[PDB]
Amino acid sequence: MEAFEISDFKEHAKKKSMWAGALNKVTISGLMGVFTEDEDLMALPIHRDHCPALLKIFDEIIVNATDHERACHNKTKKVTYIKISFDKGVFSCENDGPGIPIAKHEQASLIAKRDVYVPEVASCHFLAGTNINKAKDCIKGGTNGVGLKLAMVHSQWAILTTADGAQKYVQHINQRLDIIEPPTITPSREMFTRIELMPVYQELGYAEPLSETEQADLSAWIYLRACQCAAYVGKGTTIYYNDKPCRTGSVMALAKMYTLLSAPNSTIHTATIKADAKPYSLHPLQVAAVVSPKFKKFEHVSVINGVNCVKGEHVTFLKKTINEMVVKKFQQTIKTTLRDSCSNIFIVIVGSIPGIEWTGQRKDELSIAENVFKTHYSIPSSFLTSMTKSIVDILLQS
Amino acid sequence: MEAFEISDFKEHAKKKSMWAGALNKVTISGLMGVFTEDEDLMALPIHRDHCPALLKIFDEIIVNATDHERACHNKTKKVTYIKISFDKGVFSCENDGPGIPIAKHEQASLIAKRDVYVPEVASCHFLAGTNINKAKDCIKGGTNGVGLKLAMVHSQWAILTTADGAQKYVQHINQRLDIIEPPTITPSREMFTRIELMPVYQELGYAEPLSETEQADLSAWIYLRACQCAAYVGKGTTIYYNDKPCRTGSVMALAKMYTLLSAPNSTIHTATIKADAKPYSLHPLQVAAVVSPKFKKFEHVSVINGVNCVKGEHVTFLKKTINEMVVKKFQQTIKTTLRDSCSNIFIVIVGSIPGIEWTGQRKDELSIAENVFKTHYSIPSSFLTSMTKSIVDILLQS
Ligand SMILES: Nc1ncnc2c1ncn2[C@@H]1O[C@H](COP(=O)(O)OP(=O)(O)NP(=O)(O)O)[C@@H](O)[C@H]1O
Ligand SMILES: Nc1ncnc2c1ncn2[C@@H]1O[C@H](COP(=O)(O)OP(=O)(O)NP(=O)(O)O)[C@@H](O)[C@H]1O
Ligand SMILES: [Mg+2]
Ligand SMILES: [Mg+2]
């Protein structure tokens, strides 16, 4: 029929929500940003509709930088900084460490029948990257060879700049990937990767120059995402947002930021969840939790493999384990459901998990057998005991 | 680098969880199937790890049939049946109504430099279908031109059979899309579409001949999915699973099936939620709810646009509206959070919603502005008042 059609990747990415989510403004459950009060960092909800695909432009590039930080963290040449910028609608992200290799790609050059270099494949070729054949134990968030191309397809203009210690490579990628300019290659001896772009705000439902509220909301969201990165990356990396350092290097700092308005001056339960055997034993999970009667439902913030995912059995592992102990102790005083006993918890979980699978390119949800945690991971009893004490005291008051 | 690679669609679909979910067995929260007790239909949880991509093979084909049912419901030639079969691991789904057009695809033929017909494009060409340029008011679940190809890529062998009144078209698509046999085309006046396939069970983590428990679990899951279809499709369509008619033509029947074990002989609150203007006015939402103290947490079953999605503002619309009334009525007696007053609700929501977006190919979550429901839809107050009365009686007891 006339309606039966074949689409290419770029046209498909511009009209289909499967890649990065809705391409218009919708209600985003739990949307948050960070707002600065005095010199205090405070995470607050953003109760306005926003475009999920727009936020994924930023996220895809950000997770690419923290993926690189993970890859070189045990190598001689490492990532020391991730600089994120957002000004006048221009978004940029730069990291040091080895750049994308500046070399001709023979297969791509043969397909295109012209000289095509690796950074053009990295940025303009769908289903292309270094994680197509990812190992079980690889804890990079990246896996599909898709994310950077999504960022390009939603850019009015974009500039990729990378240097591998020998040369510098600059390439203009404009008009939602319609116009790929030939690269400019020079000698350099510098080493970094920078992505700078202007998203297609108007197509995504925003004011052509962002409105004051849109700009403030988007700036707040990116800043919180940079703060989440700062708690995830290794000991040698500093995260910057609009040049200032991000002061949330630990899950304690994240938990305080998220509960400053709710429950200031509260106690922060901490745990380092370790595993007995490799590869899991290489990746301890950091956890901080606040327990308060002021919280009216269970909430978590997860940064897993650099990704701010919202659903996963890693959360349930903590919830069920805590509930088991709460039920026990509570019964001794009376002599309660899973949401009961967890309704007063705010918990932050940050770390790497080998072998997880994702539910889509957005990586909203990770997928795994629950028994991975039961067999391999141990939650410190001191954390469980003080969490249970705090929760039981609240239950006894009502 | 050596690791920098370019992948094609089918190799990508076989390695990457983004298309259909995890490609191995993982824990699936809320996994259910239907099991027959006496002659009663009873939906029970399946507490065993299962492969999400495997279930999506079935789901993609099923939603293709209910999409056709919706497309032909107001036309002279309509869909009168959807027959789903699962036996000896062989899965098949057949619907009547107009078949896939048996016609040469010039563009596809030019690309391939051989005769390629429309049903081969429909089943073997990624990013291809009749919904690439989807209208905002189109309530079909299909949108990406991807789902049928995922089913083929996870089949050891498959047979597409379609007839359009003029001809019949039979085509063998084998070895995870590696071997596409030329079609056999004959004169016919039959009109239907059938997909029959053997999934790659072993590759997805199952026993080569399915084990007794695996077979029983998978049959139960498909049967429940067929029962959900029976509540969704139009009045002129019968759904069959393994030749038996599916006896859940209403949200009442669905709600009774899901609450038979927990709360038999309970009252079923019903509502038909209508909207003031088109396109929403064309698609009333059917709702049934059971309220019981035996219910531990809030649960919903959603069939939206034929899709059994698990997250969406359509649920929150009902939750917030009910909570508002519960808060008022409760305060009058005392003179309570959102977790409260909704913790004892099991609710079934079935219907079509125009203009929704999805968060991925799996269509786990739909995306929409909350204000669509606030401005356009009204929940009948009789349903709100009897739901509120039932909930307040429970809260007053404890
Ligand atoms: N900041 C960076 N530094 C170094 N290499 C990078 C950087 N960003 C991207 N790359 C490379 O470019 C490739 C393509 O990136 P991308 O399209 O995001 O795919 P991916 O990160 O591998 N998987 P995904 O994001 O899940 O679709 C990556 O695999 C890396 O090889
Ligand atoms: N049972 C069927 N009867 C008639 N036409 C069908 C049937 N199944 C598939 N088709 C057609 O085949 C096309 C390709 O199917 P499919 O690949 O599932 O894409 P889709 O349903 O359009 N979108 P999606 O499922 O979101 O990836 C559809 O768009 C329909 O035109
Ligand atoms: Mg990436
Ligand atoms: Mg489909």
Author numbering:
A (entry chain A), B (entry chain D): 1 to 335, 341 to 403
Paper excerpt:
The African swine fever virus (ASFV) specifically encodes a topoisomerase II (topo II), which is critical for viral replication and an attractive target for antiviral development. The ATPase domain of this enzyme is required for ATP hydrolysis and plays a crucial role in coupling DNA binding and ATP turnover with the DNA strand passage reaction. Similar to other reported type II topoisomerase ATPase structures, ASFV ATPase contains an N-terminal GHKL domain and a C-terminal transducer domain, together assembling into a heart-shaped dimeric complex. Structural comparison reveals that the ASFV topo II ATPase domain shares a conserved overall structure with its homologs from eukaryotes and prokaryotes but also has three characteristic regions, including the intra-molecular interface formed by the ATP-lid and QTK loop as well as helix α9, the K-loop in the transducer domain, and the antennae-like α-helix at the ATP binding domain.
